[model samples]
Target: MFWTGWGPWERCTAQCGGGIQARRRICENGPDCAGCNVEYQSCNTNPCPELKKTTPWTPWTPVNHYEQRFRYTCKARLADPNLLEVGRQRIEMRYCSSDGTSGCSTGTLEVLF
Candidate 1:
């Protein structure tokens, strides 16, 4: 599976916190800030518990407030003759107190034939 952010086809790894790291730049659903220091990102992961709030000026607030999750599964293919048919799916979720927003999404692949 792949997570968006930091470019396409990016895989997620474990994070320092208990939350899973599935995608990058994915905070939460919020205002679409344009040219602003803050921006809304996207991802597909599992859900996380509510995070603690932090002061805006706090240097660690950004990192401390970010909670993310991601997972993937694969299925074998049976029809393709020349291609490796593998079905896959991914899920991601994130929450950011600084931006006062959160979001959850999923991605899936079907029939490779």
Candidate 2:
């Protein structure tokens, strides 16, 4: 997440029975955040998890998949650029994905000015 001009919205997808040699990325600092600059990227894949089945008999297919990218920044100015002159407006990015058996994902990203 980078908040200076805008944001670096990002999201990730994943679903599998078992397969993840390695993966790790976690950053925080938003509420009352001053001088924030959160950047992240995760890569380590063999590219798996593809079942494909959305509407035929609907079963919801997602074996396992993974991809990620993110950015966020703040320099003490939450809002206020010449009193609504357009320096920045809105930007948001959220994500979640954990593996214990199959659970995780609440990701979101938004931006407006």
Candidate 3:
């Protein structure tokens, strides 16, 4: 494998809420990547001045008479930044009890990313 000298460390992405700083190791790889190239370091180790966006959660819906689920949407980003903000929408799902009493949740098989 081949690599370029580690790129200079870049500015942290956020002023608060702990952001990432990174340096890249370039590969002669083409437009598509074959493996890892960037290294990440935590930076901006202070609290953010404004509120971070929370996941947009939806109301729970029934999966069955006894199982229920809810979903939320989030922004997907990398450990560090790039000029275009290579963003995408991601969704998360969590299962809850349909009983609505203790609000029981399943920890494993009931989960999906």
**TM-score versus the correct structure, for each prediction:** 0.15, 0.15, 0.34
Ranking under TM-score, best-scoring first? 3, 1, 2
lDDT of 3 by residue, 1-113 (tens): 46667889899877666889999886775554566788899988765342223443445667767655544433433333232232344667554656543345433345468
Q: Where's the lowest-lDDT run of ten residues in candidate 1? A: 52-61
Summarize candidate 1's per-residue lDDT along 1-113 as a digit string, tens digits: 22224434343342222222332343235544333332333333444333332222312224355954433333333223333333434435466444454332333325677
Summed over model 3, clashes come to 0
After superposition on all CA atoms, what RMSD does each candidate show versus the true structure? 32.0, 30.6, 18.5
For model 1 the local lDDT of residue 11 reads 37
Model 2 per-residue lDDT tens digits across residues 15-96: 2222233332333444443553454444333344332212223233465685443333323321222322223335454434
Strongest candidate by TM-score? 3
- Which segments of candidate 1 are over 4 A away from where they belong? 1-83, 101-113
By lDDT, highest first, what's the ranking?
A: 3, 2, 1
Clashes of 1: 5
What lDDT would candidate 1 get against the real structure?
Answer: 0.35
Poorly placed runs, candidate 2 (over 4 Å): 1-36, 43-46, 52-113
